[PDB]
Amino acid sequence: GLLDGKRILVSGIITDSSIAFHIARVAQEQGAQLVLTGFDRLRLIQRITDRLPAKAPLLELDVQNEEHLASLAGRVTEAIGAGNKLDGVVHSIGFMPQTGMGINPFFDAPYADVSKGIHISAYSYASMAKALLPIMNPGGSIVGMDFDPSRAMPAYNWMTVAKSALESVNRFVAREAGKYGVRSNLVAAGPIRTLAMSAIVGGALGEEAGAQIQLLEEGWDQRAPIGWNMKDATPVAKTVCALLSDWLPATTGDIIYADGGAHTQLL
Amino acid sequence: GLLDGKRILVSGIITDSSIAFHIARVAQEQGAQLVLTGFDRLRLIQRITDRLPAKAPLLELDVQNEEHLASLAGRVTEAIGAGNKLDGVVHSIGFMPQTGMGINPFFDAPYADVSKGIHISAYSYASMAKALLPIMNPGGSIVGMDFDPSRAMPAYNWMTVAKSALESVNRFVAREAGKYGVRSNLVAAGPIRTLAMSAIVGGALGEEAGAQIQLLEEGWDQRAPIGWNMKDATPVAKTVCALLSDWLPATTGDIIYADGGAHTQLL
Amino acid sequence: GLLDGKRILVSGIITDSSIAFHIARVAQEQGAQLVLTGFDRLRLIQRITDRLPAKAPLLELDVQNEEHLASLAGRVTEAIGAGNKLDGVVHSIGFMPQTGMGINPFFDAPYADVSKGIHISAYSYASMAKALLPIMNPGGSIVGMDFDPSRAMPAYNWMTVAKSALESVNRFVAREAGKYGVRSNLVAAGPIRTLAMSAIVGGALGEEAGAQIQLLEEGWDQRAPIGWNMKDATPVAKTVCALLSDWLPATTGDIIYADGGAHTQLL
Amino acid sequence: MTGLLDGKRILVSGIITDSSIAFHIARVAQEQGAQLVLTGFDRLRLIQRITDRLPAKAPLLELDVQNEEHLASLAGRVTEAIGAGNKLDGVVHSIGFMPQTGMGINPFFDAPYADVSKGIHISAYSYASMAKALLPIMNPGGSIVGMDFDPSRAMPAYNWMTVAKSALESVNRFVAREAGKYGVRSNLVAAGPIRTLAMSAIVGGALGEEAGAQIQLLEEGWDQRAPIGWNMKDATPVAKTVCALLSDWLPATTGDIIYADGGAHTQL
């Protein structure tokens, strides 16, 4: 049990393809006791989370809702029991309106759209850490999901901007989390076919979704020295669990790349 | 005449200490014909800009005002004359509310304040390029001001997140501007005593402002192999002019460090 | 056991303070079956390895001796039993002559000395992977020890160049290892009081050794959001074991920073 | 005053053919008023014919960066060429070499250290040894510029030259620490691909039958990646970037890398 006895809050399950679903599955297989947070369709998410290896309380969390955030630690504490604290927090949340993605012109995305995406995808990492650090044990770990935004790329558009914001937020979350003996890190994952990829990325690409996703999949697997499988979230979930474990105890404010080594190779 | 006969739009002048004031001064000393944009205190900005080596048309430009941005190209064309286009555009604009700066807790900055800062400091780089690219000549150059946000640091707080988003925005503006034969780059300057430093950073640092700024100047100057004088914007102004000129014609989506070499040295 | 049943080669032990000694100890506490390699003071190394939880075979390996490298895989197979292969390889080797370190002028290190340092510290990562890759199992992992060379610093001098070379070598060794299903990563560790730190770094600093090392420990701990203990190799050793495990299976050609997050913070 | 490098005395090393990056650096620097001192290696009679194709006449000095005597006499020979009492305002290092075993389709692991070490000596250590030799005859406000090819990520064919470029980048950061004492800047120009003798003879030669396909993929792929396009046949943009660094217009940039690659390294 890599996470045996650890109490871990995992956010971001929307379907069984979600990276958070696989983080939760691997974490439960490794002995973690989970609290899950879901957004919007809690009744559908409930149905999905029933397919996880073990039962886990499901709490509603809209990161844009200040009352959900203010009552969060209290709702987590009643779910895990008084006296118990969290050892891990998984932020696997992202959003960007379709206007800030795909073939929609980069300059045409209104700031209202971009700002909502930045709020959910980047600011929410600080807001979740602010709400959960008061109930985190020393030695704990906060992990957020990133997609390497160091270079501009096709389709990802304003989400790349949101991920660059996220990386910077992570380094500041590490400064605040250090006061609690808590580490804060991002897992920069390769492309995994999720509902976000299909509905947000795919949908915003339209006529170009097929070619772009094919080129992304073939190019990523070629670039990755050990290959990359866009339909297998397990290596990403295992990396998130390594950061939640006690086996990366000196890493904070950082980014672990679970991308097959793709970011290290030009071609 | 490094910028001889170039029509250059310079935004960001508020006082004679502004980085945009020194860029405007150096650019005019190099033969550039300027169009200056100012925000909020245009009567006072007219007084400051009257101190430049040559008088230049001053236009109002609030980067949050959609009408100012939509009318920008037409107002510039009216200033430079029909049939003329801009060769350079300088974005030297930044803002971050007090809550997102200094000794005020990072976690206590509301997203409304952070979003306002990201709008002005990062999104406006894309909205200014979108407004001005249709009126820019091939071979042109768009330059924005950055402050190395790759590592977290005391006091800079959410402005670091805005600069990280700005760096990502710049890489996407480079893609769009490339279609016009225009380069887009950021100049990451070392610290310079401007109104933004004293009023925004210093204001948010409270009683710890004098010591933190003195510590920053000494540290930066010690780390920089060629030294650093935060009272002198000229080295920074010259670096922006090098980017506006045809002497860096193969550089786009990039950050040029005008910081004394500080970011290349640990101690 | 995180490394249950894995056969791992650990090079680089000279004293019980060596980072490789703690990597070997932690790997053995986690079920790894080790094969140890040592250089020059084999008798001392044998006494040192007698302090490890389990007595592992000790193999002579001077990384500048082509006979030792050409016979390495055969000697390793004699040690771990024919029919058995390595699951992991740890490179924890470094050397730089005194002229290429400390207060000795950077410009005065003769190339013969710098080349020796680069050969042991950087090229040996590729020569070790070349010898051991044919006897490594798919899923295997090669880990090297690095010290963040992205920025110049005092005293490290030509060893910073050797580490920059090593980071590049690591990225190519990942291209080669990838075809065998083997990962290749580096652990950029924070400062640890080892024999190399006192004899090589401290030795080259002269009478400035205590003050410089005291400043390094204080500065590193100050910068690390989770703190840093120069007398504690265990967090570093734990990180190397995480890379040797199946829990980072999508990371290759990469660098994981086991430095307390110090590289992500300016101050 | 009249030219970006007016009145500056600049040493330019690395000219071998008129396609060399150093040749175009020399040409553009002379076009901007720089008085040059050129350095050449091995084929000095052939190089003298190449250096006569430049806009203005410049002295040509022999310099094998692996030769202690050429380095020890260098500042003296430069002082003789520019006149005593005059100093260099710039130094350009556009030198590189890596034996075939360390390049192309030759297996990365089979490159012997003797070969790799020669390449790192010529391509990375020499940047420090040239600075050590020329900093004592450089003026405050001076500038040392070296040539780099972005080694932050592994790539096909570049193999051990990537390792030398990584070492060079780290050397440049330390050369900045030393040059700073003299008020001199030290930077690299990470240029995009340019059709030079090194590309054809060393890279192409090491690529064997894959030379044409890899060069065509490199050429078109870089142009595509670069938001402003990239012309592998035009070294002028790179030459202008080196002159920009040798000028007084990047006065606060040291120990750094300026990318003259059309922006390609910023795009995935």
Ligand SMILES: NC(=O)c1ccc[n+]([C@@H]2O[C@H](COP(=O)([O-])OP(=O)(O)OC[C@H]3O[C@@H](n4cnc5c(N)ncnc54)[C@H](O)[C@@H]3O)[C@@H](O)[C@H]2O)c1
């Ligand atoms: N799928 C990939 O290839 C990939 C790669 C790298 C990083 N990521 C990151 O992984 C994370 C999860 O994405 P995914 O690919 O698993 O997709 P997904 O669609 O399964 O997950 C996105 C999640 O964000 C949640 N979310 C959106 N708005 C929210 C709000 N206001 N409040 C709370 N939750 C909200 C959704 O409910 C959903 O569970 C995101 O941060 C994403 O950017 C994904």
Ligand SMILES: NC(=O)c1ccc[n+]([C@@H]2O[C@H](COP(=O)([O-])OP(=O)(O)OC[C@H]3O[C@@H](n4cnc5c(N)ncnc54)[C@H](O)[C@@H]3O)[C@@H](O)[C@H]2O)c1
């Ligand atoms: N001063 C430094 O040390 C330093 C260092 C690195 C980068 N920078 C950057 O330089 C730029 C200019 O800052 P400065 O230091 O010269 O300070 P400054 O106060 O002189 O400049 C900031 C400018 O932003 C303008 N601005 C604010 N909100 C705006 C809006 N809504 N629309 C249009 N303009 C708006 C202000 O009117 C002012 O002219 C900023 O991007 C800043 O982050 C400054």
Ligand SMILES: NC(=O)c1ccc[n+]([C@@H]2O[C@H](COP(=O)([O-])OP(=O)(O)OC[C@H]3O[C@@H](n4cnc5c(N)ncnc54)[C@H](O)[C@@H]3O)[C@@H](O)[C@H]2O)c1
């Ligand atoms: N100590 C630190 O603070 C620190 C920090 C980051 C990285 N590192 C790296 O970790 C590694 C281990 O060093 P350490 O700090 O544990 O010091 P150490 O003195 O314990 O180990 C250095 C080892 O290198 C071996 N070595 C030297 N020349 C060799 C050769 N020719 N062939 C084979 N082995 C050879 C020595 O025998 C010794 O075992 C080195 O690569 C070092 O640069 C150390």
Ligand SMILES: NC(=O)c1ccc[n+]([C@@H]2O[C@H](COP(=O)([O-])OP(=O)(O)OC[C@H]3O[C@@H](n4cnc5c(N)ncnc54)[C@H](O)[C@@H]3O)[C@@H](O)[C@H]2O)c1
């Ligand atoms: N050509 C490109 O695409 C490209 C791209 C980026 C960087 N670079 C770098 O630019 C520099 C110049 O290369 P180039 O492309 O102009 O090729 P080139 O063949 O024209 O120049 C290489 C030069 O190095 C010289 N040299 C080799 N060994 C030497 C020694 N022992 N002493 C002195 N000089 C020596 C050669 O004589 C020649 O003048 C090299 O450092 C190269 O790595 C080239």
Ligand SMILES: Cc1cc(=O)oc2cc(OCc3cn(Cc4ccc(Oc5ccccc5)c(O)c4)nn3)ccc12
């Ligand atoms: C290199 C490359 C080659 C190519 O041919 O095409 C590309 C297309 C790309 O851009 C589009 C994209 C990003 N990804 C990975 C992902 C998918 C879902 C994510 O979750 C989200 C959650 C909310 C909002 C938006 C996204 C996410 O953050 C990352 N897949 N598709 C990126 C790179 C290339």
Ligand SMILES: Cc1cc(=O)oc2cc(OCc3cn(Cc4ccc(Oc5ccccc5)c(O)c4)nn3)ccc12
């Ligand atoms: C290393 C260090 C040591 C130390 O003791 O203290 C520090 C304080 C720092 O953070 C505070 C800061 C940043 N600077 C530089 C600047 C000043 C004005 C800017 O303009 C703005 C425009 C709008 C909004 C906000 C700022 C700007 O973008 C950057 N000066 N003050 C950063 C680093 C250290």
Ligand SMILES: Cc1cc(=O)oc2cc(OCc3cn(Cc4ccc(Oc5ccccc5)c(O)c4)nn3)ccc12
């Ligand atoms: C910021 C700072 C302040 C200060 O006052 O002083 C410093 C000295 C530093 O540079 C010197 C150094 C590096 N370290 C960490 C290490 C120690 C041993 C290693 O092993 C080796 C094996 C073979 C050869 C050389 C070293 C090693 O690779 C890294 N400790 N000392 C770096 C930074 C500062």
Ligand SMILES: Cc1cc(=O)oc2cc(OCc3cn(Cc4ccc(Oc5ccccc5)c(O)c4)nn3)ccc12
């Ligand atoms: C992106 C990409 C796509 C692709 O399909 O293929 C590639 C092949 C590459 O690697 C091979 C190479 C590097 N270049 C650029 C150069 C050419 C000459 C140089 O000068 C030297 C001086 C002495 C010794 C060796 C080289 C030099 O430093 C860099 N041209 N060929 C690199 C990148 C790609």
